Design a protein around this nucleic acid. Structure first.
Ligand code: CA
Ligand code: CA
Length: 460
RNA sequence: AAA
């Protein structure tokens, strides 16, 4: 059992517990291929090792070995054939691959290669290489493999910064991880911009990195400093590196600023290069949604003639792109929610309902998203299905998720409005009286609350 | 990646 025990001491994708789910694997593979072709980074060893790991999980071990050989080839060709500790991730993945393929003599050869380097560098462990480069590699792998891994990713980069606070690579990874984690909390009450200072430091330490700049721009826009942010958008757009990724986030920036036509032009250029990106399809749908809202206001809700044709084009285009996003990544919860809401605009309540039913079964990484799912389904029930019974059920389910948020407050207000309406048509509805007491209790008005709870009690 |  020495071989398997030794393999478990290696630091590589096989021991990083990435937990890649089958239903997210097609999208992951597409994003890995996009990154190989279009993200300009100093080292590409990590991304080719992740592609090999994906190929292995797909049952394509010979294809996996080709990616590991490419990782080794690129490491030398583009860095003066110098030795680099990042090779140990590749060798570790070779050892695991050969073990799984039954090429056990070769697996042992790769264990021996790793051991030889750990000894040469006075590493305390025989096989587990302790160095900042491999902490970074672990972090980048976690960061590519879905939101459930982001706290672990951030901690990988933080471990480096606790020893070397000006390390450029880990500054970048820590800032991106922190930014995405801030996004998970962006609608929660009293959320704070933990990623802002990290992003400023990462831009300082990585002055040519346009990916970091556009995230800094977006966080500045979040914090009410759009003009400052726009300077970073312009700097990133002036450099050719990673252009297709810069376009995604610049487009978000311009959409949120109100320059939707400009956003769409950038996204359509980006789609020429990465047509499988679910982020691009979702962002494109969001632009069409924003244009729909614009047309509705200019025509005060009653577009006719060419305006009606334009509106229908926006609705059907948003549906097309939201459907494209969820075909490619069926776990993309918020894209299903935007899709359901757009089927309401199209007048197809059966397809809206179908997508809401799908959403009610999901288990998002961000648990608060289920507040939005119940809230919007409750609104659909109240306003499209004319079912106060089901509206109340789902407003209550949103409220039961206790985390204070924009949506939980809207759900309380919507429930209040609904029950006040029912009491106007029937002042002695006992269920409505106690729900109104509940609402007032959640708001803090304890005397009004107990009044309605008592009033409700008497009648019974 | 909605918000
Ligand atoms: Ca390039
Ligand atoms: Ca290749």
């Amino acid at each position: 059992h020495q071989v398997k025990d030794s393999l478990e001491q290696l630091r590589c994708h096989f021991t990083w517990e990435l937990s890649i789910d089958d239903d997210e694997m097609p999208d992951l593979e597409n994003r890995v291929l996009d990154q190989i072709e279009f993200l300009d980074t100093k080292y590409s060893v990590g991304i080719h090792n992740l592609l090999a790991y994906v190929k292995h999980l797909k049952g394509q071990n010979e294809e996996a070995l080709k990616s590991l050989k490419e990782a080794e080839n690129l490491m030398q060709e583009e860095h003066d054939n110098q030795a680099n500790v990042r090779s140990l991730v590749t060798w570790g993945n070779f050892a695991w691959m050969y073990y799984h393929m039954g090429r056990l003599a070769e697996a042992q050869t790769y264990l021996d290669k790793v051991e030889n380097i750990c000894k040469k560098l006075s590493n305390p462990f025989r096989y587990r290489m302790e160095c900042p480069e491999i902490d970074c590699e672990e972090g980048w792998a976690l960061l590519k493999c879905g939101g459930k891994n982001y706290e672990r990713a951030k901690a990988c980069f933080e471990k480096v910064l606790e020893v070397d606070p000006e390390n450029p690579e880990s500054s970048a990874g820590y800032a991106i991880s922190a930014y995405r984690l801030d996004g998970f909390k962006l609608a929660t009450k009293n959320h704070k911009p933990f990623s802002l200072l990290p992003l400023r430091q990462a831009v300082r330490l990585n002055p040519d990195n346009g990916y970091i700049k556009v995230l800094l721009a977006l966080k500045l826009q979040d914090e009410g400093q759009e003009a400052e942010g726009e300077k970073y958008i312009e700097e990133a757009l002036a450099n050719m590196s990673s252009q297709t990724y810069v376009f995604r986030y610049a487009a978000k920036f311009y959409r949120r600023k109100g320059s939707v036509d400009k956003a769409l032009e950038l996204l359509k250029k980006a789609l020429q290069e990465t047509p499988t990106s679910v982020l691009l399809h979702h962002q494109i749908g969001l632009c069409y949604k924003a244009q729909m809202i614009q047309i509705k206001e200019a025509t005060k809700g009653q577009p006719r003639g060419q305006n009606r044709e334009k509106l229908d084009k926006m609705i059907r285009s948003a549906i097309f792109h939201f459907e494209s996003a969820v075909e490619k990544k069926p776990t993309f919860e918020v894209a299903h929610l935007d899709l359901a809401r757009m089927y309401i605009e199209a007048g197809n309540h059966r397809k809206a309902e179908e997508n809401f039913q799908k959403l009610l079964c999901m288990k998002p990484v961000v648990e608060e998203t289920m507040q939005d799912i119940h809230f919007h389904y409750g609104r659909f029930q109240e306003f499209q299905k004319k079912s106060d019974v089901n509206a109340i059920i789902h407003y209550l389910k949103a409220i039961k998720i206790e985390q204070a948020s924009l949506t939980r407050d809207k759900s309380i207000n919507s429930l209040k409005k609904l029950v006040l309406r029912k009491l106007r048509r029937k002042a002695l509805d006992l269920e409505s009286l106690s729900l109104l007491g509940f609402v007032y209790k959640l708001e803090g008005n304890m005397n009004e609350a107990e009044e309605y709870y008592e009033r409700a009690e008497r009648l019974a």
